[PDB]
Amino acid sequence: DQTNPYKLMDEAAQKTFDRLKNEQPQIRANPDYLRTIVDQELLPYVQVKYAGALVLGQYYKSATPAQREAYFAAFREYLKQAYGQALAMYHGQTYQIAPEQPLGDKTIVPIRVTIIDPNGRPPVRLDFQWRKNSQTGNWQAYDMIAEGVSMITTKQNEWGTLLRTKGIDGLTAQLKSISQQKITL
Template sequence: MKMLKKIILGSVMSIAVLFSAQATAGNSNPYQMMNQTADKLFNDIKTHQTEIKADPNYLRTIVRNDLMPYVHVKYAGLLVLGKYLKTADAQQRDKFFDVFGQFIEQSYAQVLTQYTNQKVEIEKEKPVDDKVIVSIRVNVLASDNVAPIKLDFKWRKNSKTGEWQAYDMAAEGVSMVATKQNEWSGTLRKQGIDALIKKIEQSIQKPITLSH
């Protein structure tokens, strides 16, 4: 359990938007979307353990099918770029969002190697009322009276469509958006977005490896 907690805290981006979902038709409740996404993801991981052990990169297929259709890559990327968005032209932005999406896929898949059928407990639904920001707690439980790993997924209501979209996650209080802003700001400031894109491209070439 300590290893799982260390990896989650040390790779916040890797699971940062694990349930980050772009609103689909009928998605007017972030709690329902959270539960639906989690059920599909973890059930598929349990069902395909044979394939995963034979080829860990199969986890990318699961992530691609279960998560990526719903991940709000562009919105998350805009938050990460922050003020440096203004320095990029349209072509550079498109390329960044493309590799950033692949980075999310690769990162999710690697962290999901740590999932070994632990119980995942999602906060019970609460009234949303007129709120525009909602934080939903997800606990990864363990045996032997070990404290759960606390993950908080932040959801924002789209002012135009009225639908909800997850945009950030905090693992034990560590924000994904803030983490990647800090980590990549130096490259953006000194070398520009093309250098960051190259850095991300190198990162997404890493194969998925099992650690348990």
Template sequence: MSKFSIRNWLAKLLLVMTALFAAQSLMAADSPYTLTQQAADKLFGDMKANQAKIKQTPDYLRTLVRQDLMPYVHVNYAGSLVLGKSFSATTAEQRQKFFAAFDKFIEQAYAQALTLYSDQEIQVQKEQLNGDSQATVRVRLIQKNGQPPLNLNFQWRKNSKTGQWQVYDMVAEGVSMVETKKQEWGALLRKEGIDALTARVEKAASVPVTFGK
């Protein structure tokens, strides 16, 4: 083999190895664990930087949730789980209106939950994979004064269309938000239909974020 051929072959090999390394790095960067850590760092960093504004206007937490957390949430999939068997009895327009309301509800619920945060230590544990498209990431909030830690499990799913990992449920101390809302709203959905449920969810989503007295 000539020197030119060897040089050309080595160049191609280096190119392939570089591409493979870049692909592996991208996969690692997009893992549920890494994404959870990334979101947590950004969110709590923004909260610390805006403490005065948050205390004056607690609803500002919704802005932080919208920009730091909601891009990771698979709202439509979570909403379809809440609708359950009733999903097939709805029109595409009805579902879109419900998903839009549910999106705002998740924003409000997460923002309200953040009012309980008081600079606790956050520990993000490595994800537990369930097949190729499901994963669980546990986040532990280390409490002060010797209280036991709070365990939050974030359920992730790889979007079949985009290939991106997204959160579809949060399980706090064994209680699933999706299952809780499915049970809470199920009777209204079966009795009065999705339009009535959408109105209920819109009302819940509009409740201002407040600090406990």
């Protein structure tokens, strides 16, 4: 049900976390496989262009069609790497998802997923950020903030300077560069 981000979050967590739980041998043999799991289970619920547009800010409008295309393709690769690296710590832990609350007229909704430690250590909080398309009523995720670390605003200052000194092509090259870093465990 696309008009309720709590239902979508539940389903997306179920698919993503079950696959990370059940394919640990493959992940241990090649941690970059995490990109594939992220790509296939989680990114269908993520509005990749919306997230990319937030990072790009004022530089979007003046960018050329080719520059835009290259930027968005690099950004999507970066998201696979980032979500992959952030979820590498998940290997089958129990998790709890914040319960459904009134949506009212809201168009942005954060939803906390808590990863429970099996030994009673403190939990790890993943705050997924959901946005509504007000024309269609449908929701998609655009960020996941992992104990305060955002996939898109954490590097805002460095990416701001890079855009200002080298434009969108500078940032695209940097996103590509980051996406080629080996995921580690």
